[PDB]
Amino acid sequence: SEHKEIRMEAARTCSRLLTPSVSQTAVQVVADVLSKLLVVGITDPDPDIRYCVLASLDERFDAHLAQAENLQALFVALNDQVFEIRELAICT
Amino acid sequence: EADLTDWNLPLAFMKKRHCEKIEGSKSLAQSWRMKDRMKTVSVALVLCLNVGVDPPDVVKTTPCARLECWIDPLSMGPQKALETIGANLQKQYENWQPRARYKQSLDPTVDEVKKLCTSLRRNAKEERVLFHYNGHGVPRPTVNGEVWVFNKNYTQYIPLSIYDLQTWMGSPSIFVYDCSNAGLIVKSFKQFALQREQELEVSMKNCIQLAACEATELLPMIPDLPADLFTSCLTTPIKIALRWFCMQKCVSLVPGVTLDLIEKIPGRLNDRRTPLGELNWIFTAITDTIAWNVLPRDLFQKLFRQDLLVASLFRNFLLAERIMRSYNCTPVSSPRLPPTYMHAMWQAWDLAVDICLSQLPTIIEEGTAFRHSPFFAEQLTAFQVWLTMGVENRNPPEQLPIVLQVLLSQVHRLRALDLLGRFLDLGPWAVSLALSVGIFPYVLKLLQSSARELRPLLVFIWAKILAVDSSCQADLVKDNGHKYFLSVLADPYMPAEHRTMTAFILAVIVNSYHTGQEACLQGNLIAICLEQLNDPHPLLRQWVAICLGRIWQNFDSARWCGVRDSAHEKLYSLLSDPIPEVRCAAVFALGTFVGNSAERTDHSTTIDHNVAMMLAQLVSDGSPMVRKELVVALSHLVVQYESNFCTVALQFISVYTQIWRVLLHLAADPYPEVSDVAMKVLNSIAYKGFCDWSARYFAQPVMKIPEEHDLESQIRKEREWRFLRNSRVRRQAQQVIQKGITRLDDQIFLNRNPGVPSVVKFHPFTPCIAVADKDSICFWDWEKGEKLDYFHNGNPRYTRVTAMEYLNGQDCSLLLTATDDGAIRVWKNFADLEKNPEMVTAWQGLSAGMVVDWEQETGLLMSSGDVRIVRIWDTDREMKVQDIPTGADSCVTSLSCDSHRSLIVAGLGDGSIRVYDRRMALSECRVMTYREHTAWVVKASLQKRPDGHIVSVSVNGDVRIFDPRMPESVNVLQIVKGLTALDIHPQADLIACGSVNQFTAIYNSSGELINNIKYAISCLAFHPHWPHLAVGSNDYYISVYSVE
C-alpha cells in the first residue's frame, strides 16, 4: 500500500491487534505476522517507518525477540544511517 | 450449552479409522554406521634446516623471527640442537596421536629421502603416510616443485623426485609444506598429478595437503612470531592463540595481563577442571560447531568424523586461517574449502578467553581458587530456547555439536539428556539429524551407566530411535548394555510408561532377529515378561503380549520355557481382556506359540489343541481387527498345523476341525476384508501385521500438546461455530409445536427415489431422507426437495436392508444400516455429497423378523431377530455384551429399548407384546404381556419418555394404546381401525395414516383430525422435531407434507 501514511498506521495496527495474543495454533499465528512485520523495520526506504516499526516492539513480544533470526534482524538494525534508530536498537 | 451437549452426545468407532494405515519408510545415509579406519603409518619429518646457514634468497634483520618449536638454536649447541627439535616435534604430534610411528629426518639428500619414504610406505600401503617438511637453510621451491639439500654441503640444489613421491603417496597420505611459497608446491603438484593423468590415460589426489602460504606470498619476519608458524598452529594451537590474543587490541580492557602470565595458566592441557584444560576443551567444541554450520553436509563427516589425526590437526587449520589473514598469508588445503575467518562463533571464543584471563593476574600469585567458565551454561540455554518454541522444522539448531561434549561431562549431563530427549521426541528429521551428527556412539556407550536417571532419559531416547530405526540390530545386546533394559522391563519403582517403552525395546530386540530370543535365555525374559501381564496400562499389556509372541519366533529353545513354565495357559488371563488391542496382542502370541514350534507334535498336539479350543471362543466381536487377528492367529497355528490339515479340511464337504469351524464362521462376514481373510485361509488349506501398527504409533511426538483448549484449534472452531448453530435449530424445528399445531397446508415434493419401503429414516437438521433399495444406502433432500443418490450396502438381493440409524445427527453424520439376515454395516462421507462414501465397519450381528435401536442417548447399539434375543452391543469391548430373550419363542418384529424409564418393549412374531424391566434377571424379563394382538406386531412405539406409553399395531388389523403399569390396552384412537403405515412421533404428538386413496390421511393424539393431502403405502415417518411428514410410500417414490 505504497502510499506512505497507510504503511505507518497499518504497522501500528498489526502490533496492537497481536498484543492480546499453551498451544502451537495461536503461537503460529503470532509468529506468522510478527516476522512479516519485522522485515519492514530494516527494509523501508522511508526512514521514519523503519523507526515506527521498531518502536512498536516491546517486552510484549520478548520471547520471539529472543529468537535468533530476529536477533539477526536486530543486529542488522543495530548498524544504521539514522542515529535515533541505532539509539532505539541498543535498548532491545 | 450446545457445543458441550454436542461433544457429551457420544460417537462410534472413533479409534477404528486409525489402525490399518500401517506406516513404511526407507533407510537413510545413517553413516554413523561408519566403515573406513585407515589410520596413520608414520611421520616423515623431512626437517630441512641447515642450521645457521642463511638461504641466500633472504636478508634478515636483528629483530628477527627465530624460535622453532619454542627453542632458539642461535643461543644453543648448533649441530647438536638439530636432533633435539626433531624429537620435540614428534612428541607434539604424539599428543594428537601416538599409535603411529616417527623418523626424525635431518637435512636428508635424495637417497636418504628414498630410504625414509619407501621403507615406511612398504610397511603399510593402504594406510595414511604423513609427509611433513620445513623449508629452512634451503632456498624457495622451484617452478617444478624441487628442494636444496645434499650432504649438508652449501644449501645445494637437488631435484625432489616429487613425481616419484606421487606414486609413493599414490595410495592414501597427508602432506604439510612449511615454506615461503607452499601454494607453488601445491600448484606444481597438480601439474605433476596431471602428468600422472597423462600416463593413467593408458587416486588422482585423495591425499590431504596443508600449505603454509599461497604461491605468491612470502613468510613473515616479525620477531614476535615463532618462525614455524603454520606448524606451530597445527601442533600447539593454544600457545599460539593466547600469544596472538594478548598483542592484538589497542586498549586492554583487562589490563593486568602480560606474556609472562599466559605462560603460567594452571593445568597440563589435558584436564577440563584446570584453566589450561578448559580453554582447549571450549576450542574443541567451537571448531566442530563452525564445521557443522558452514560446510556442505557429507564433507563434515569425511574430514571431521572418519579418522582422528585427519580431523584433529584440521580443527587447528581454522585457527591458522585467522592469524594468517591478520598478517599477509592465505593458507590453502588439498580439498576446495569455503572461507571461515569471519564467523560469529569466533567472538564467543574471544569472550571466553577474556572472562578467563580477567582472573589470572591474581591466580598466579594470590593462591586464588579460580572461577570456572560459564560457556556451556550459556550455550545449552540457547538450545533450550529454540526447543521451547520448538515451532518448526526449518534452519535446524546450530548448538547441536556442543551437546555431544555434555553427554560425556558428568557435571552437566542431566539437563542435556532431557533437552535431547525432547529433540528426539520431535519428528523423524530430528532423529535423523542426531544420528547423522554422530550421537550414536555416545547413546551406545552411555547404557554402561545403570544410573536410574537413564530410565526417563537414555531409555526413552533409545525407544524413539528404534521407533523408526530398523538398523540398530540388538547391538547393545551383542554388547553389554542390555542389562539396563532387563531391570526396567520389570522394575516397579516408576510408572508403567517406563515399562511400556522397555517392553517395546525388548520387543524390538526380539523383532530384530534370533539374537533377542538368545537374549531371552541369557536373562529368563519369558518369566519376568509374564509378571507385566498384570499392570493396568493397556499399551503395556499390548507390548508384553507382542514381546512374548515375538519370543515364540522359530527359536524353539525359547518356546521350551513357554511350555515348561506354562506361559501359554497363564497368558489366557489376557483372553479375559475387554481391550480389543490387548486381546489381539495375546491372540497373536498364542498364534506364534503353536505356529513356530519346529513341527513338534506328540505331547504338544494335546497341549496346543487346548490353545486352539481356547482361541476358538473369541468370534464374539464386531471388531474388524479382532476378526482379522483371530483368523491370523489361526494362520499362525497353521504355520505347523498345515502338517495335519489336508484330511481335516474334508470333514465339512476334533480340535483341528474346531479351527476349521471358526474359519467357516468368518468367511461370510459383511466387512469384505473379514470375509476375505477367513475365505483365503480356508482356500489355502483346501489348495493343500498388528505389531507393525504397534510400531506405526511409537514415532508420534509425546511432549507436544493436545488441541481443544486453543481457541485457534480448527476441531474446536468447527465445533464451536457449526454445532452451536443447533441451539436455534433444536428450538425452531419445534417452535410450531410450542406455538400449537396448524393445518398441513403444503407439500415439498412428490416423485421417484431409488429405494423400497423396507427402510425409511429422516435425518434431523440436514437433508437426507434415507429410503433404500433392499441392497442399498439411498437418499433424497427434504430441505430443498431434490434428488440425492443411490449407493450399495453390498448385502445379497435375497436379503433386505431393514433398518437405519445415525451415530450422531448433526456433526459427524456416520450412519448404520441393518439387514433381515442380521448384516450390520456403518457408513460415512455420502452425508453432504462431498465425495464417494466408504464403510468404516460392518459385522454379521444377529448371524423370521429383525429390529434395531441405537442409543445416541447413552452410547449403546441394540438389535433383535432369529437369535431369539435382543443383542446389546458395546463399542468399548467391540462386542455383543448383554442379551435379553424373546420371553415367548416367536422372534421380535418391532421394538424400543427405552432408557428414560429403562425398559424394553418386544412386539413379537406371534403378535403378543412383551414389556421388560431390563434390570430383572435375564430368564424372567416379563413385567407385562398383552395379547390384544396375536398375529405379528408391525408397530411397537414404547415411547422413551416420562409418559413412556405404548402404541402398537398387528396383522390382526387393529391399533391399540397400552400402559406398562396396567395388564391391558387402556385407550383407543383407531382413526382408521388398522392400516399398512402409521407413526406416533414422541416430540410432535401427531399420527399419519397410509390411506389407500390418492389422498394421505392425517390425525392427532387427541383423536382430532387434520386436512388430508395428495400422494397402498408401506412406510412413513414424521421429522424428529418438525410437525412435518416424510412418506417413503411405495413403487420407488417419496411424498412430503407440511404447514406453510
**Could you give phi then psi for residue B135, rounded to 5 degrees?**
-95, 70
Question: CA–CA separation, B16 vs B584, rounded Å?
Answer: 14
* Contacting residues for A41 by C-beta, under 8 A, at least 6 apart: A50, A53, A54, A73, A77
Question: CA–CA separation, B595 vs B551, rounded Å?
Answer: 12
> End-to-end alpha-carbon separation of chain A, Å?
29
CA B584 to chain centre: 21
Residues in chain A closer than 8 A to B714 (CB atoms): 25
Shortest CA distance to B605 belongs to which of B548, B549, B563, B661?
B563
Report whether B13 contacts B840 (CB < 8 A): yes
* DSSP line for B751-763: EE-S--TT-EEE-
User: Quick one: cell of A20?
Assistant: 492480546
Shortest CA distance to B500 belongs to which of B470, B455, B458?
B455
Report whether B914 contacts B957 (CB < 8 A): no
Neighbours of B537 (CB within 10 A): 17
CA B825 to chain centre: 32
Helix axes B460-468, B496-512, angle to 10 degrees: 40
Contact B710 A25 (CB under 8 A): yes
SS3 B582: helix
Query: Which H or E run includes B350?
Result: helix B345-357
**Could you give phi then psi for residue B138, rounded to 5 degrees?**
-150, 115
Across the interface, of B382, B395, B712, the residue whose CB is closest to A26 is B712
To 10 degrees, the CA torsion angle through A28, A34, A40, A41? -150
Contact B389 A28 (CB under 8 A): no
User: Quick one: cell of B11?
Assistant: 460417537
- In this complex, is the C-beta atom of B707 within 8 Å of any C-beta atom belonging to chain A? yes
Question: CA–CA separation, B535 vs B540, rounded Å?
Answer: 7
Residues in chain A closer than 8 A to B385 (CB atoms): 66-67
CA distance A13 to chain B (A): 20
Contact A23 B395 (CB under 8 A): no
| DSSP symbol at B706 | P
Interface test with A, best of B347, B707, B710 (most A CBs within 10 A): B710
Neighbours of B944 (CB within 10 A): 18
Question: CA–CA separation, B1039 vs B1030, rounded Å?
Answer: 6
> Distance of CA B185 to CAs B135, B192, B239, Å?
11, 10, 28
Sheet of strand B760-762: strand arrangement: B760-762, B768-771, B776-781, B786-792
Contact B705 A28 (CB under 8 A): no
Across the interface, of A23, A28, A63, the residue whose CB is closest to B709 is A23
**What is chain B's percent helix, strand, coil content, to nearest 5?**
40, 20, 40
- Cell 495496527 belongs to residue: A13
Contact A66 B386 (CB under 8 A): no
> Distance of CA B513 to CAs B489, B551, B553, B585, Å?
19, 10, 9, 19
Report whether A53 contacts A12 (CB < 8 A): no
Query: Which H or E run includes B56?
Result: none
Report whether B1020 contacts B1037 (CB < 8 A): no
Question: CA–CA separation, B733 vs B1022, rounded Å?
Answer: 12
Count Cβ atoms within 10 A of the Cβ of residue B119 and give its class: 0-12 exposed, 13-18 middle, 19 or more buried: exposed
CA distance B388 to chain A (A): 10
User: Between vectors from CA B681 to CA B680 and to CA B687, what angle results, nearest 5°?
Assistant: 80
Across the interface, of A23, A68, A69, the residue whose CB is closest to B710 is A23
Contact A31 B711 (CB under 8 A): no
Question: CA–CA separation, B158 vs B148, rounded Å?
Answer: 5
Question: CA–CA separation, B438 vs B460, rounded Å?
Answer: 18
Query: Which H or E run includes B958?
Result: strand B958-962
User: Quick one: cell of B966?
Assistant: 396396567
**Could you give phi then psi for residue B442, rounded to 5 degrees?**
-70, -45
Count Cβ atoms within 10 A of the Cβ of residue A79 and give its class: 0-12 exposed, 13-18 middle, 19 or more buried: exposed
Report whether B964 contacts B1001 (CB < 8 A): no
Question: CA–CA separation, B525 vs B512, rounded Å?
Answer: 16
CA B957 to chain centre: 64
Q: What is the DSSP pairing of strand B913-917 with strand B903-908?
A: antiparallel
User: Quick one: cell of B419?
Assistant: 533437552
Question: CA–CA separation, B137 vs B154, rounded Å?
Answer: 9
Neighbours of B919 (CB within 10 A): 9
| DSSP symbol at B338 | P
- Determine the residue type at B796: P
Count Cβ atoms within 10 A of the Cβ of residue B966 and give its class: 0-12 exposed, 13-18 middle, 19 or more buried: exposed
User: Quick one: cell of B695?
Assistant: 510400531
Shortest CA distance to B545 belongs to which of B478, B633, B477?
B633
Question: CA–CA separation, B499 vs B489, rounded Å?
Answer: 5
CA distance B711 to chain A (A): 8
> Distance of CA B93 to CAs B11, B98, B127, B217, B775, Å?
73, 7, 17, 27, 86
In chain A, count H helices and then E strands: 6, 0
Closest residue in A to B715 (Cα) is: A25
Gaps after which residues in chain B, C–N over 2.5 Å?
Answer: 202, 653, 688, 847, 1015
SS3 B223: coil
User: Quick one: cell of B903?
Assistant: 425398559
Give the A:B interface size as CB pairs under 8 Å: 34
Report whether B837 contacts B791 (CB < 8 A): yes
CA distance B390 to chain A (A): 9
Question: CA–CA separation, B508 vs B510, rounded Å?
Answer: 5
The b-or-e profile of B975-988 (16+ CB within 10 A means b, else e) is bbebbbbbbbbbbb
Shortest CA distance to B507 belongs to which of B692, B700, B702?
B692
Shortest CA distance to B678 belongs to which of B628, B617, B623, B639?
B628
Contact A26 B704 (CB under 8 A): no
CA distance A80 to chain B (A): 20
Question: CA–CA separation, B588 vs B593, rounded Å?
Answer: 9
| DSSP symbol at B1029 | E
> Distance of CA B273 to CAs B96, B239, B270, B278, B360, Å?
20, 19, 9, 7, 15
Residue B102's region, left for phi above 0, alpha for psi from -120 to 50, else beta, is: beta
Question: CA–CA separation, B749 vs B1030, rounded Å?
Answer: 10
* Contacting residues for B177 by C-beta, under 8 A, at least 6 apart: B133, B135, B185, B186, B209, B210, B211, B212
Neighbours of B374 (CB within 10 A): 12
Question: CA–CA separation, B497 vs B499, rounded Å?
Answer: 5
User: Between vectors from CA B78 to CA B74 and to CA B84, what angle results, nearest 5°?
Assistant: 100
* Contacting residues for B3 by C-beta, under 8 A, at least 6 apart: B719, B720, B723, B724
- Cell 414422541 belongs to residue: B986
Alpha carbons within 13 A on the beta-carbon side of B67: 13
To 10 degrees, the CA torsion angle through B814, B819, B823, B824? 20
Q: Name the resolution in angstroms.
A: 4.7
Shortest CA distance to B46 belongs to which of B157, B181, B149?
B149
* DSSP line for B788-835: EEEEE----TTS-EEEEEESSSSSS--EEEEETT--EEEEESGGGTSS
Shortest CA distance to B1031 belongs to which of B757, B716, B772?
B757
Residue A70's region, left for phi above 0, alpha for psi from -120 to 50, else beta, is: alpha
Question: CA–CA separation, B609 vs B604, rounded Å?
Answer: 8
* Contacting residues for B919 by C-beta, under 8 A, at least 6 apart: B902
Contact A25 B705 (CB under 8 A): no
Report whether B221 contacts B64 (CB < 8 A): yes
Shortest CA distance to B352 belongs to which of B255, B248, B247, B279?
B279
